[PDB]
Amino acid sequence: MQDYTVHIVDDEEPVRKSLAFMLTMNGFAVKMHQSAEAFLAFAPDVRNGVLVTDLRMPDMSGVELLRNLGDLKINIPSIVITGHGDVPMAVEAMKAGAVDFIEKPFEDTVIIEAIERASEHLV
Amino acid sequence: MQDYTVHIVDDEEPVRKSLAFMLTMNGFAVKMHQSAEAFLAFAPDVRNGVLVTDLRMPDMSGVELLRNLGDLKINIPSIVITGHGDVPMAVEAMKAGAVDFIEKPFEDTVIIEAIERASEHLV
């Protein structure tokens, strides 16, 4: 239907890869990124992309990434996923503009539907 | 400065009262409500009001209240406070349009600042 790309961010390669493979296996156009810094640098070039970022990353947190994107006034539907979240962080993420903040572990169905949902925000 | 009213919702009278007294003591115009149902019924008449509602209430949850307000397309800056929250609920609250979702216990300073913040949304 729609030709968008799901960009995956997480400093951990193994996690980065498993999520990428699973989505690739479900028909999605997918692109991996090594760090949030790397994705931020590339962000100004993204067209029709949805972001799925991990939360707890060493240099820049998923939430700081979203704020940074906001500062650059870029506008990319984003979903934060994390195995170490909490209410405060979850609120910061939504405040930074996230379409959703989801806790691990979750079924493929969950992230897929949230990606499909976030894609609706693409103008 | 601004003449707004903070409306307090919580099925528990004691809690309802302590929060009302504290805010009253800090110069705020305050109004208590017995239930979310009661506040909803009154909502169409609110002008320049900010809502501070508890989360876990027997008939209608703070989050359902916010959704109900949305359905009626009313638009009242709202803050959810709760001693029994979690990530999912917190996300639902922000999704329903909450200016904030804060966990108890918290210092007066916290709710006061969030009320002052939410009042900025009043057109």
Side-chain angles (χ1 to χ4, degrees), chain A residues 2-71 74 76-123, chain B residues 2-71 74 76-123:
Chain A
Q2 204 178 180
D3 184 40
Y4 60 100
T5 300
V6 186
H7 298 267
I8 302 169
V9 178
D10 195 328
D11 51 284
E12 286 169 56
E13 168 162 336
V15 169
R16 179 193 309 164
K17 290 163 55 187
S18 75
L19 174 53
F21 165 75
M22 186 281 276
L23 297 179
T24 283
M25 287 298 279
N26 282 279
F28 291 91
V30 179
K31 183 180 184 72
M32 295 200 271
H33 296 267
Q34 298 192 175
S35 69
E37 183 179 351
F39 181 70
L40 184 55
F42 180 76
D45 289 318
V46 173
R47 299 289 183 279
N48 286 292
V50 165
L51 169 70
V52 170
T53 176
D54 170 64
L55 201 223
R56 310 294 186 178
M57 302 179 284
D59 309 315
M60 190 175 94
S61 78
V63 153
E64 312 190 78
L65 173 49
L66 298 188
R67 282 189 200 97
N68 285 160
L69 289 178
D71 299 318
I74 294 171
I76 290 181
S78 301
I79 296 153
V80 179
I81 52 171
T82 188
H84 310 83
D86 56 39
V87 168
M89 272 302 136
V91 169
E92 287 176 54
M94 303 309 283
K95 278 183 178 174
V99 173
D100 210 338
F101 181 98
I102 312 175
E103 295 186 300
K104 300 168 175 171
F106 49 72
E107 297 283 60
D108 299 335
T109 273
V110 169
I111 190 57
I112 290 179
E113 301 185 75
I115 286 155
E116 284 165 346
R117 252 192 162 295
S119 70
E120 307 288 46
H121 294 297
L122 292 175
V123 279
Chain B
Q2 204 178 180
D3 184 40
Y4 60 100
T5 300
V6 186
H7 298 267
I8 302 169
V9 178
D10 195 328
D11 51 284
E12 286 169 56
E13 168 162 336
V15 169
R16 179 193 309 164
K17 290 163 55 187
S18 75
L19 174 53
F21 165 75
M22 186 281 276
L23 297 179
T24 283
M25 287 298 279
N26 282 279
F28 291 91
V30 179
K31 183 180 184 72
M32 295 200 271
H33 296 267
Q34 298 192 175
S35 69
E37 183 179 351
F39 181 70
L40 184 55
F42 180 76
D45 289 318
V46 173
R47 299 289 183 279
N48 286 292
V50 165
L51 169 70
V52 170
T53 176
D54 170 64
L55 201 223
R56 310 294 186 178
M57 302 179 284
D59 309 315
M60 190 175 94
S61 78
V63 153
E64 312 190 78
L65 173 49
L66 298 188
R67 282 189 200 97
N68 285 160
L69 289 178
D71 299 318
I74 294 171
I76 290 181
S78 301
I79 296 153
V80 179
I81 52 171
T82 188
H84 310 83
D86 56 39
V87 168
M89 272 302 136
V91 169
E92 287 176 54
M94 303 309 283
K95 278 183 178 174
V99 173
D100 210 338
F101 181 98
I102 312 175
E103 295 186 300
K104 300 168 175 171
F106 49 72
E107 297 283 60
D108 299 335
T109 273
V110 169
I111 190 57
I112 290 179
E113 301 185 75
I115 286 155
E116 284 165 346
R117 252 192 162 295
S119 70
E120 307 288 46
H121 294 297
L122 292 175
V123 279

